[PDB]
Amino acid sequence: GRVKGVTIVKPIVYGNVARYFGKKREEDGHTHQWTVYVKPYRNEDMSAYVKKIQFKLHESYGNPLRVVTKPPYEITETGWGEFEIIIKIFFIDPNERPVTLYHLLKLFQSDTNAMLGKKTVVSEFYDEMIFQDP
């Protein structure tokens, strides 16, 4: 915890989208395409201060520790069940503690949203990254 620059606060959104295939895939029983993500709230480039974002997927996925080193910070897969993703954001300067986020991958639409005629599932949450200007 060393003071190296001015403290900056950046709003972010994180979570996932998912789309029902329509019919189950015969090969693996998958039913959905999904994309898990972290994004700045505003339209800006976070690679100035973020080195990489890791998305730790369920152990049924190959290379489940997925790392994205440049924008966009997204991983797209297919699946059939819901699970917890651990998201870890690493800064350029290792003086900064990584931000660890926890997110339940949502594939199944709520009955409320299904009744409001919404095609795609969206489960999105908010945060503020606090770090020093490098």
Short mmCIF file of N, CA, C and O in Angstrom, two decimals:
data_model
loop_
_atom_site.label_atom_id
_atom_site.label_comp_id
_atom_site.label_asym_id
_atom_site.label_seq_id
_atom_site.Cartn_x
_atom_site.Cartn_y
_atom_site.Cartn_z
N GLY A 1 0.84 -1.17 0.00
CA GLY A 1 0.00 0.00 0.00
C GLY A 1 0.87 1.22 0.00
O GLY A 1 1.12 1.83 1.06
N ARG A 2 1.38 1.54 -1.19
CA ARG A 2 2.23 2.68 -1.36
C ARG A 2 1.52 3.69 -2.20
O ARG A 2 0.80 3.35 -3.12
N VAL A 3 1.68 4.93 -1.84
CA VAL A 3 1.13 6.02 -2.57
C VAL A 3 2.03 6.28 -3.76
O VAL A 3 3.16 6.65 -3.63
N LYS A 4 1.50 6.06 -4.94
CA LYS A 4 2.21 6.26 -6.20
C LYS A 4 1.58 7.25 -7.14
O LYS A 4 2.26 7.72 -8.05
N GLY A 5 0.31 7.58 -6.97
CA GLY A 5 -0.30 8.57 -7.85
C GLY A 5 -1.62 9.04 -7.29
O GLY A 5 -1.90 8.83 -6.11
N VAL A 6 -2.44 9.68 -8.13
CA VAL A 6 -3.73 10.20 -7.68
C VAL A 6 -4.76 9.07 -7.72
O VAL A 6 -4.85 8.33 -8.70
N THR A 7 -5.55 8.93 -6.65
CA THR A 7 -6.63 7.96 -6.65
C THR A 7 -7.73 8.31 -7.64
O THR A 7 -8.19 9.43 -7.66
N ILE A 8 -8.07 7.34 -8.49
CA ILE A 8 -9.04 7.49 -9.58
C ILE A 8 -10.17 6.51 -9.22
O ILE A 8 -9.93 5.43 -8.70
N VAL A 9 -11.40 6.88 -9.51
CA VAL A 9 -12.57 5.99 -9.39
C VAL A 9 -13.21 5.77 -10.80
O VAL A 9 -13.44 6.74 -11.51
N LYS A 10 -13.34 4.52 -11.27
CA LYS A 10 -13.96 4.26 -12.58
C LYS A 10 -15.23 3.37 -12.42
O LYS A 10 -15.12 2.25 -11.96
N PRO A 11 -16.39 3.83 -12.87
CA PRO A 11 -17.56 2.92 -12.84
C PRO A 11 -17.44 1.83 -13.85
O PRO A 11 -17.02 2.08 -14.98
N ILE A 12 -17.80 0.60 -13.44
CA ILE A 12 -17.87 -0.55 -14.35
C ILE A 12 -19.20 -1.26 -14.22
O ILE A 12 -19.87 -1.12 -13.18
N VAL A 13 -19.54 -2.02 -15.26
CA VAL A 13 -20.63 -3.03 -15.27
C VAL A 13 -20.06 -4.38 -15.53
O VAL A 13 -19.04 -4.52 -16.25
N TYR A 14 -20.67 -5.40 -14.96
CA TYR A 14 -20.19 -6.76 -15.21
C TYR A 14 -21.34 -7.73 -15.11
O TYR A 14 -22.35 -7.45 -14.42
N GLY A 15 -21.18 -8.85 -15.79
CA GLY A 15 -22.13 -9.96 -15.67
C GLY A 15 -22.26 -10.69 -16.98
O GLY A 15 -21.22 -11.00 -17.60
N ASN A 16 -23.47 -10.99 -17.45
CA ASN A 16 -23.55 -11.80 -18.66
C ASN A 16 -24.87 -11.62 -19.38
O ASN A 16 -25.85 -11.15 -18.80
N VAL A 17 -24.83 -11.96 -20.64
CA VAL A 17 -25.97 -12.14 -21.50
C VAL A 17 -26.02 -13.61 -21.87
O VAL A 17 -24.99 -14.30 -21.75
N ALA A 18 -27.21 -14.10 -22.23
CA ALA A 18 -27.44 -15.47 -22.71
C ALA A 18 -28.67 -15.51 -23.64
O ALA A 18 -29.63 -14.75 -23.47
N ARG A 19 -28.59 -16.36 -24.66
CA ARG A 19 -29.64 -16.57 -25.68
C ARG A 19 -29.87 -18.07 -25.75
O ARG A 19 -28.90 -18.82 -25.99
N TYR A 20 -31.11 -18.51 -25.47
CA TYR A 20 -31.64 -19.88 -25.75
C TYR A 20 -31.43 -20.29 -27.22
O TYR A 20 -31.69 -19.50 -28.12
N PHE A 21 -30.85 -21.47 -27.45
CA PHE A 21 -30.62 -21.92 -28.83
C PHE A 21 -31.95 -22.05 -29.61
O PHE A 21 -31.98 -21.79 -30.84
N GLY A 22 -33.00 -22.47 -28.91
CA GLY A 22 -34.26 -22.85 -29.57
C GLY A 22 -34.47 -24.36 -29.49
O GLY A 22 -35.53 -24.82 -29.06
N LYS A 23 -33.42 -25.11 -29.79
CA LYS A 23 -33.42 -26.55 -29.59
C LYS A 23 -32.08 -26.96 -29.01
O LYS A 23 -31.06 -26.45 -29.38
N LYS A 24 -32.10 -27.96 -28.16
CA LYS A 24 -30.92 -28.50 -27.55
C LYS A 24 -29.96 -29.07 -28.61
O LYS A 24 -30.39 -29.62 -29.61
N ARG A 25 -28.67 -28.89 -28.41
CA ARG A 25 -27.71 -29.42 -29.35
C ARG A 25 -27.47 -30.87 -29.00
O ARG A 25 -27.20 -31.20 -27.87
N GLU A 26 -27.56 -31.71 -30.00
CA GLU A 26 -27.44 -33.12 -29.82
C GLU A 26 -26.10 -33.58 -29.30
O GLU A 26 -26.05 -34.43 -28.46
N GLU A 27 -25.03 -32.99 -29.77
CA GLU A 27 -23.72 -33.41 -29.38
C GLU A 27 -23.36 -33.30 -27.90
O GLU A 27 -22.83 -34.21 -27.33
N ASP A 28 -23.67 -32.18 -27.29
CA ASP A 28 -23.31 -31.94 -25.91
C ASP A 28 -24.43 -31.53 -24.99
O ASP A 28 -24.20 -31.24 -23.87
N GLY A 29 -25.64 -31.54 -25.48
CA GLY A 29 -26.78 -31.08 -24.71
C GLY A 29 -26.85 -29.61 -24.36
O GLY A 29 -27.61 -29.22 -23.49
N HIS A 30 -26.04 -28.79 -25.01
CA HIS A 30 -26.04 -27.39 -24.73
C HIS A 30 -27.28 -26.78 -25.27
O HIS A 30 -27.73 -27.15 -26.37
N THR A 31 -27.76 -25.77 -24.56
CA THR A 31 -29.02 -25.11 -24.86
C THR A 31 -28.89 -23.60 -25.10
O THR A 31 -29.85 -22.98 -25.64
N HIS A 32 -27.74 -23.01 -24.66
CA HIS A 32 -27.52 -21.56 -24.68
C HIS A 32 -26.14 -21.14 -25.14
O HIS A 32 -25.19 -21.81 -24.89
N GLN A 33 -26.06 -20.06 -25.89
CA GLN A 33 -24.91 -19.25 -26.00
C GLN A 33 -24.93 -18.11 -24.95
O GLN A 33 -25.97 -17.54 -24.66
N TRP A 34 -23.77 -17.83 -24.37
CA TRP A 34 -23.65 -16.79 -23.31
C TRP A 34 -22.34 -16.06 -23.47
O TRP A 34 -21.38 -16.57 -24.09
N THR A 35 -22.30 -14.84 -22.98
CA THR A 35 -21.11 -14.01 -22.94
C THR A 35 -21.01 -13.37 -21.58
O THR A 35 -21.96 -12.72 -21.14
N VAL A 36 -19.90 -13.62 -20.90
CA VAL A 36 -19.64 -13.01 -19.61
C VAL A 36 -18.71 -11.83 -19.86
O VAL A 36 -17.87 -11.85 -20.80
N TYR A 37 -18.88 -10.76 -19.11
CA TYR A 37 -18.10 -9.56 -19.42
C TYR A 37 -17.82 -8.63 -18.23
O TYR A 37 -18.49 -8.68 -17.18
N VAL A 38 -16.81 -7.80 -18.42
CA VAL A 38 -16.62 -6.57 -17.63
C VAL A 38 -16.45 -5.43 -18.63
O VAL A 38 -15.78 -5.57 -19.65
N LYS A 39 -17.13 -4.34 -18.40
CA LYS A 39 -17.07 -3.17 -19.28
C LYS A 39 -16.98 -1.91 -18.47
O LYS A 39 -17.54 -1.84 -17.40
N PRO A 40 -16.35 -0.88 -19.01
CA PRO A 40 -16.48 0.40 -18.37
C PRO A 40 -17.91 0.84 -18.53
O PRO A 40 -18.56 0.56 -19.55
N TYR A 41 -18.40 1.62 -17.58
CA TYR A 41 -19.74 2.19 -17.77
C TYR A 41 -19.76 3.12 -18.98
O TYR A 41 -20.65 3.03 -19.82
N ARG A 42 -18.82 4.04 -19.01
CA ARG A 42 -18.65 4.99 -20.10
C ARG A 42 -17.82 4.36 -21.19
O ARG A 42 -17.18 3.35 -21.00
N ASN A 43 -17.83 4.99 -22.35
CA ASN A 43 -17.14 4.46 -23.49
C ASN A 43 -15.67 4.85 -23.52
O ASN A 43 -15.31 5.78 -24.16
N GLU A 44 -14.85 4.06 -22.87
CA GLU A 44 -13.50 4.38 -22.74
C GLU A 44 -12.70 3.12 -22.79
O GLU A 44 -13.26 2.02 -22.78
N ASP A 45 -11.40 3.28 -22.86
CA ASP A 45 -10.53 2.17 -23.00
C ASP A 45 -9.88 1.83 -21.68
O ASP A 45 -9.04 2.55 -21.21
N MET A 46 -10.18 0.68 -21.09
CA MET A 46 -9.64 0.39 -19.76
C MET A 46 -8.24 -0.18 -19.79
O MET A 46 -7.62 -0.25 -18.74
N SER A 47 -7.74 -0.59 -20.97
CA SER A 47 -6.34 -1.06 -21.12
C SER A 47 -5.23 -0.08 -20.72
O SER A 47 -4.10 -0.48 -20.50
N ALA A 48 -5.53 1.18 -20.60
CA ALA A 48 -4.59 2.14 -19.94
C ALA A 48 -4.23 1.81 -18.45
O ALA A 48 -3.15 2.15 -17.95
N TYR A 49 -5.11 1.12 -17.75
CA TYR A 49 -4.88 0.80 -16.32
C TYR A 49 -5.13 -0.65 -15.94
O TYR A 49 -4.62 -1.12 -14.96
N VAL A 50 -5.88 -1.37 -16.74
CA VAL A 50 -6.12 -2.81 -16.53
C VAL A 50 -5.10 -3.60 -17.39
O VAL A 50 -5.06 -3.43 -18.57
N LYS A 51 -4.31 -4.47 -16.77
CA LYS A 51 -3.46 -5.42 -17.53
C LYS A 51 -4.24 -6.63 -18.14
O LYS A 51 -3.97 -7.06 -19.20
N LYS A 52 -5.09 -7.28 -17.34
CA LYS A 52 -5.86 -8.41 -17.79
C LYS A 52 -7.06 -8.68 -16.89
O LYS A 52 -7.06 -8.31 -15.70
N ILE A 53 -8.03 -9.38 -17.44
CA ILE A 53 -9.17 -9.82 -16.64
C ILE A 53 -9.26 -11.30 -16.83
O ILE A 53 -9.30 -11.78 -17.96
N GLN A 54 -9.23 -12.03 -15.72
CA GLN A 54 -9.44 -13.45 -15.70
C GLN A 54 -10.91 -13.81 -15.42
O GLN A 54 -11.47 -13.26 -14.51
N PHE A 55 -11.45 -14.80 -16.10
CA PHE A 55 -12.78 -15.31 -15.86
C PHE A 55 -12.64 -16.82 -15.58
O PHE A 55 -12.36 -17.63 -16.47
N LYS A 56 -12.82 -17.19 -14.33
CA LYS A 56 -12.70 -18.56 -13.94
C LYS A 56 -14.02 -19.27 -14.14
O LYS A 56 -14.95 -19.03 -13.35
N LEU A 57 -14.09 -20.12 -15.15
CA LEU A 57 -15.31 -20.83 -15.51
C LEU A 57 -15.44 -22.15 -14.72
O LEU A 57 -14.52 -22.57 -14.02
N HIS A 58 -16.58 -22.81 -14.87
CA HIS A 58 -16.83 -24.08 -14.20
C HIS A 58 -15.82 -25.09 -14.78
O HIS A 58 -15.41 -24.98 -15.95
N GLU A 59 -15.50 -26.10 -13.99
CA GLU A 59 -14.50 -27.14 -14.33
C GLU A 59 -14.91 -28.04 -15.47
O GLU A 59 -14.09 -28.71 -16.07
N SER A 60 -16.18 -28.02 -15.88
CA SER A 60 -16.54 -28.74 -17.12
C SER A 60 -16.04 -28.05 -18.36
O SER A 60 -16.16 -28.61 -19.41
N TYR A 61 -15.53 -26.81 -18.29
CA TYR A 61 -15.01 -26.17 -19.49
C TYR A 61 -13.52 -26.46 -19.59
O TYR A 61 -12.82 -26.46 -18.56
N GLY A 62 -13.01 -26.65 -20.80
CA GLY A 62 -11.55 -26.66 -21.04
C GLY A 62 -10.87 -25.31 -20.70
O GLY A 62 -11.49 -24.26 -20.89
N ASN A 63 -9.66 -25.39 -20.13
CA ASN A 63 -8.81 -24.20 -19.78
C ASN A 63 -9.74 -23.26 -19.06
O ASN A 63 -9.92 -22.14 -19.50
N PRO A 64 -10.37 -23.71 -17.98
CA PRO A 64 -11.40 -22.91 -17.33
C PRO A 64 -10.94 -21.56 -16.78
O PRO A 64 -11.76 -20.72 -16.50
N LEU A 65 -9.64 -21.36 -16.58
CA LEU A 65 -9.15 -20.07 -16.17
C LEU A 65 -8.88 -19.24 -17.45
O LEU A 65 -7.84 -19.32 -18.04
N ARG A 66 -9.88 -18.50 -17.90
CA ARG A 66 -9.79 -17.79 -19.15
C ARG A 66 -9.30 -16.40 -18.89
O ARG A 66 -9.82 -15.73 -18.02
N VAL A 67 -8.31 -15.94 -19.64
CA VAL A 67 -7.67 -14.66 -19.41
C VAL A 67 -7.87 -13.79 -20.64
O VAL A 67 -7.61 -14.24 -21.74
N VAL A 68 -8.26 -12.54 -20.47
CA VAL A 68 -8.37 -11.62 -21.62
C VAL A 68 -7.44 -10.44 -21.30
O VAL A 68 -7.62 -9.78 -20.23
N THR A 69 -6.46 -10.20 -22.19
CA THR A 69 -5.46 -9.16 -21.95
C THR A 69 -5.73 -7.88 -22.69
O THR A 69 -5.07 -6.89 -22.44
N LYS A 70 -6.64 -7.88 -23.64
CA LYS A 70 -7.03 -6.63 -24.25
C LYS A 70 -8.56 -6.58 -24.52
O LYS A 70 -9.19 -7.60 -24.59
N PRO A 71 -9.11 -5.39 -24.64
CA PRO A 71 -10.50 -5.25 -24.85
C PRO A 71 -10.95 -5.89 -26.13
O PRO A 71 -10.15 -5.98 -27.01
N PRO A 72 -12.23 -6.34 -26.23
CA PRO A 72 -13.20 -6.24 -25.14
C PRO A 72 -12.98 -7.37 -24.15
O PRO A 72 -12.56 -8.49 -24.52
N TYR A 73 -13.33 -7.11 -22.90
CA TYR A 73 -13.13 -8.08 -21.80
C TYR A 73 -14.38 -8.94 -21.67
O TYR A 73 -15.21 -8.76 -20.79
N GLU A 74 -14.45 -9.94 -22.52
CA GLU A 74 -15.60 -10.78 -22.74
C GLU A 74 -15.11 -12.19 -23.05
O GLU A 74 -14.11 -12.30 -23.76
N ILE A 75 -15.89 -13.20 -22.70
CA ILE A 75 -15.67 -14.61 -23.06
C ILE A 75 -17.01 -15.13 -23.46
O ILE A 75 -17.99 -14.97 -22.69
N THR A 76 -17.10 -15.69 -24.66
CA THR A 76 -18.30 -16.26 -25.22
C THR A 76 -18.21 -17.74 -25.30
O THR A 76 -17.24 -18.26 -25.78
N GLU A 77 -19.21 -18.45 -24.77
CA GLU A 77 -19.23 -19.89 -24.77
C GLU A 77 -20.65 -20.37 -25.01
O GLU A 77 -21.63 -19.59 -25.12
N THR A 78 -20.80 -21.68 -25.00
CA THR A 78 -22.13 -22.29 -24.94
C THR A 78 -22.23 -23.16 -23.74
O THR A 78 -21.22 -23.49 -23.12
N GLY A 79 -23.44 -23.47 -23.31
CA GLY A 79 -23.59 -24.28 -22.08
C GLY A 79 -25.03 -24.74 -21.90
O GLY A 79 -25.85 -24.48 -22.76
N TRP A 80 -25.31 -25.40 -20.78
CA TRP A 80 -26.68 -25.87 -20.40
C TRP A 80 -27.00 -25.67 -18.93
O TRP A 80 -28.10 -25.98 -18.49
N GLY A 81 -26.01 -25.32 -18.10
CA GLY A 81 -26.28 -25.03 -16.72
C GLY A 81 -25.70 -23.74 -16.26
O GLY A 81 -24.72 -23.24 -16.80
N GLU A 82 -26.22 -23.29 -15.13
CA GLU A 82 -25.76 -22.11 -14.43
C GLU A 82 -24.69 -22.42 -13.42
O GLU A 82 -24.71 -23.43 -12.80
N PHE A 83 -23.69 -21.54 -13.31
CA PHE A 83 -22.62 -21.68 -12.34
C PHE A 83 -21.99 -20.37 -11.97
O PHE A 83 -22.08 -19.37 -12.70
N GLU A 84 -21.28 -20.39 -10.87
CA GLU A 84 -20.52 -19.22 -10.43
C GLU A 84 -19.21 -18.98 -11.22
O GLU A 84 -18.41 -19.91 -11.37
N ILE A 85 -19.03 -17.75 -11.71
CA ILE A 85 -17.77 -17.33 -12.33
C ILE A 85 -17.06 -16.41 -11.35
O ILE A 85 -17.67 -15.56 -10.71
N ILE A 86 -15.77 -16.66 -11.17
CA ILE A 86 -14.95 -15.73 -10.43
C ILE A 86 -14.19 -14.88 -11.44
O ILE A 86 -13.44 -15.41 -12.27
N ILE A 87 -14.44 -13.58 -11.35
CA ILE A 87 -13.84 -12.58 -12.20
C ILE A 87 -12.74 -11.84 -11.42
O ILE A 87 -12.98 -11.33 -10.36
N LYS A 88 -11.54 -11.74 -11.98
CA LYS A 88 -10.46 -11.07 -11.29
C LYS A 88 -9.80 -10.07 -12.27
O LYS A 88 -9.27 -10.45 -13.32
N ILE A 89 -9.81 -8.81 -11.89
CA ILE A 89 -9.28 -7.74 -12.63
C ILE A 89 -7.87 -7.35 -12.06
O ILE A 89 -7.73 -7.03 -10.90
N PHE A 90 -6.86 -7.39 -12.92
CA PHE A 90 -5.47 -7.10 -12.55
C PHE A 90 -5.05 -5.82 -13.17
O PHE A 90 -5.35 -5.54 -14.33
N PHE A 91 -4.43 -4.98 -12.37
CA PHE A 91 -3.96 -3.68 -12.84
C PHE A 91 -2.56 -3.78 -13.43
O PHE A 91 -1.80 -4.72 -13.19
N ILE A 92 -2.21 -2.76 -14.16
CA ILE A 92 -0.89 -2.67 -14.78
C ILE A 92 0.24 -2.67 -13.73
O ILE A 92 1.24 -3.30 -13.89
N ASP A 93 0.08 -1.87 -12.72
CA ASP A 93 0.98 -1.84 -11.61
C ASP A 93 0.60 -2.88 -10.61
O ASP A 93 -0.45 -2.77 -10.04
N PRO A 94 1.47 -3.86 -10.35
CA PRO A 94 1.19 -4.77 -9.22
C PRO A 94 1.20 -4.11 -7.78
O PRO A 94 0.81 -4.73 -6.81
N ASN A 95 1.58 -2.84 -7.62
CA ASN A 95 1.18 -2.12 -6.36
C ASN A 95 -0.39 -2.19 -6.02
O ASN A 95 -0.80 -2.00 -4.85
N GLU A 96 -1.23 -2.41 -7.05
CA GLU A 96 -2.69 -2.43 -6.91
C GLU A 96 -3.16 -3.84 -6.63
O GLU A 96 -2.86 -4.78 -7.36
N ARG A 97 -3.93 -3.96 -5.57
CA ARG A 97 -4.67 -5.19 -5.27
C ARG A 97 -5.62 -5.48 -6.45
O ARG A 97 -6.35 -4.60 -6.88
N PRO A 98 -5.59 -6.68 -6.97
CA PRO A 98 -6.62 -7.07 -7.92
C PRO A 98 -8.05 -6.96 -7.34
O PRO A 98 -8.24 -7.11 -6.14
N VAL A 99 -9.01 -6.67 -8.18
CA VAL A 99 -10.44 -6.66 -7.78
C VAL A 99 -11.01 -8.03 -8.13
O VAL A 99 -10.87 -8.51 -9.27
N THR A 100 -11.58 -8.70 -7.13
CA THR A 100 -12.21 -9.97 -7.33
C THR A 100 -13.71 -9.79 -7.30
O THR A 100 -14.21 -9.21 -6.40
N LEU A 101 -14.41 -10.25 -8.34
CA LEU A 101 -15.89 -10.18 -8.41
C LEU A 101 -16.47 -11.56 -8.55
O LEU A 101 -15.83 -12.43 -9.13
N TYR A 102 -17.70 -11.74 -8.12
CA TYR A 102 -18.35 -13.05 -8.13
C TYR A 102 -19.66 -12.87 -8.93
O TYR A 102 -20.34 -11.85 -8.79
N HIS A 103 -19.93 -13.79 -9.85
CA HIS A 103 -21.09 -13.67 -10.73
C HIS A 103 -21.71 -14.97 -11.10
O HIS A 103 -21.02 -15.83 -11.67
N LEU A 104 -23.01 -15.11 -10.83
CA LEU A 104 -23.76 -16.32 -11.27
C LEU A 104 -24.16 -16.20 -12.70
O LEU A 104 -24.89 -15.28 -13.06
N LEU A 105 -23.60 -17.07 -13.56
CA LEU A 105 -23.95 -17.07 -14.94
C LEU A 105 -25.44 -17.41 -15.09
O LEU A 105 -25.85 -18.49 -14.70
N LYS A 106 -26.21 -16.49 -15.67
CA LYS A 106 -27.61 -16.64 -15.84
C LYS A 106 -27.95 -17.00 -17.24
O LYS A 106 -27.64 -16.29 -18.15
N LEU A 107 -28.58 -18.14 -17.40
CA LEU A 107 -29.08 -18.61 -18.69
C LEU A 107 -30.61 -18.56 -18.72
O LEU A 107 -31.15 -18.38 -19.75
N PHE A 108 -31.27 -18.84 -17.62
CA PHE A 108 -32.74 -19.04 -17.68
C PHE A 108 -33.44 -17.72 -17.37
O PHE A 108 -33.18 -17.14 -16.31
N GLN A 109 -34.27 -17.25 -18.29
CA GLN A 109 -35.03 -15.99 -18.07
C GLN A 109 -35.97 -16.06 -16.84
O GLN A 109 -36.52 -17.11 -16.57
N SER A 110 -36.08 -14.98 -16.06
CA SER A 110 -37.12 -14.91 -14.98
C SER A 110 -38.51 -14.95 -15.63
O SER A 110 -38.68 -14.44 -16.76
N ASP A 111 -39.49 -15.55 -14.96
CA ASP A 111 -40.88 -15.52 -15.48
C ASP A 111 -41.39 -14.09 -15.67
O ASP A 111 -42.12 -13.83 -16.60
N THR A 112 -40.94 -13.14 -14.85
CA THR A 112 -41.35 -11.74 -14.97
C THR A 112 -40.89 -11.22 -16.34
O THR A 112 -41.69 -10.70 -17.15
N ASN A 113 -39.59 -11.39 -16.59
CA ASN A 113 -39.02 -10.92 -17.84
C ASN A 113 -39.58 -11.67 -19.04
O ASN A 113 -39.85 -11.04 -20.03
N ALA A 114 -39.76 -13.00 -18.92
CA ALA A 114 -40.39 -13.78 -20.01
C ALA A 114 -41.79 -13.20 -20.33
O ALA A 114 -42.12 -12.94 -21.48
N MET A 115 -42.55 -12.89 -19.28
CA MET A 115 -43.87 -12.30 -19.46
C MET A 115 -43.76 -10.90 -20.07
O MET A 115 -44.65 -10.52 -20.78
N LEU A 116 -42.70 -10.13 -19.80
CA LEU A 116 -42.48 -8.79 -20.46
C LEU A 116 -41.87 -8.90 -21.89
O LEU A 116 -41.44 -7.90 -22.48
N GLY A 117 -41.88 -10.12 -22.45
CA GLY A 117 -41.43 -10.44 -23.80
C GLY A 117 -39.98 -10.20 -24.15
O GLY A 117 -39.68 -9.86 -25.28
N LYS A 118 -39.06 -10.38 -23.19
CA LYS A 118 -37.67 -10.08 -23.40
C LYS A 118 -36.98 -11.33 -23.94
O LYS A 118 -37.07 -12.37 -23.32
N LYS A 119 -36.27 -11.19 -25.07
CA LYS A 119 -35.66 -12.32 -25.81
C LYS A 119 -34.43 -12.89 -25.08
O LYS A 119 -34.26 -14.11 -24.96
N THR A 120 -33.60 -12.02 -24.55
CA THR A 120 -32.30 -12.46 -24.08
C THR A 120 -32.19 -12.21 -22.65
O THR A 120 -32.77 -11.24 -22.16
N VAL A 121 -31.50 -13.11 -21.96
CA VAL A 121 -31.32 -12.99 -20.54
C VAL A 121 -30.17 -11.98 -20.39
O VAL A 121 -29.18 -12.04 -21.17
N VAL A 122 -30.30 -11.09 -19.41
CA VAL A 122 -29.20 -10.15 -19.05
C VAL A 122 -29.11 -10.11 -17.58
O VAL A 122 -30.07 -9.85 -16.96
N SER A 123 -27.96 -10.43 -17.00
CA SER A 123 -27.76 -10.31 -15.57
C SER A 123 -26.50 -9.43 -15.39
O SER A 123 -25.38 -9.87 -15.57
N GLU A 124 -26.73 -8.18 -15.06
CA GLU A 124 -25.70 -7.15 -15.04
C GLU A 124 -25.70 -6.40 -13.68
O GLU A 124 -26.74 -5.96 -13.19
N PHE A 125 -24.52 -6.22 -13.15
CA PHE A 125 -24.24 -5.61 -11.87
C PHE A 125 -23.20 -4.48 -12.04
O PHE A 125 -22.51 -4.35 -13.06
N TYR A 126 -23.08 -3.69 -11.00
CA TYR A 126 -22.31 -2.42 -11.02
C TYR A 126 -21.22 -2.44 -9.97
O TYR A 126 -21.33 -3.08 -8.89
N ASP A 127 -20.14 -1.74 -10.30
CA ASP A 127 -19.07 -1.58 -9.38
C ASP A 127 -18.28 -0.37 -9.77
O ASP A 127 -18.63 0.31 -10.76
N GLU A 128 -17.34 -0.01 -8.88
CA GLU A 128 -16.44 1.12 -9.04
C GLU A 128 -15.05 0.61 -8.70
O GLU A 128 -14.85 0.07 -7.61
N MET A 129 -14.14 0.69 -9.65
CA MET A 129 -12.75 0.37 -9.44
C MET A 129 -12.04 1.60 -8.91
O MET A 129 -12.16 2.70 -9.47
N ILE A 130 -11.30 1.40 -7.83
CA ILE A 130 -10.51 2.45 -7.19
C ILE A 130 -9.06 2.06 -7.35
O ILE A 130 -8.68 1.02 -6.88
N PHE A 131 -8.25 2.88 -8.04
CA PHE A 131 -6.87 2.55 -8.23
C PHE A 131 -6.08 3.85 -8.44
O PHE A 131 -6.67 4.94 -8.54
N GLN A 132 -4.76 3.77 -8.55
CA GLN A 132 -3.98 5.00 -8.76
C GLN A 132 -3.55 5.24 -10.16
O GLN A 132 -3.16 4.34 -10.84
N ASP A 133 -3.62 6.50 -10.58
CA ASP A 133 -3.32 6.88 -11.93
C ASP A 133 -1.85 6.60 -12.28
O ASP A 133 -0.99 7.33 -11.78
N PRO A 134 -1.57 5.57 -13.16
CA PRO A 134 -0.20 5.18 -13.55
C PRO A 134 0.44 6.02 -14.68
O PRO A 134 -0.14 7.02 -15.17
#
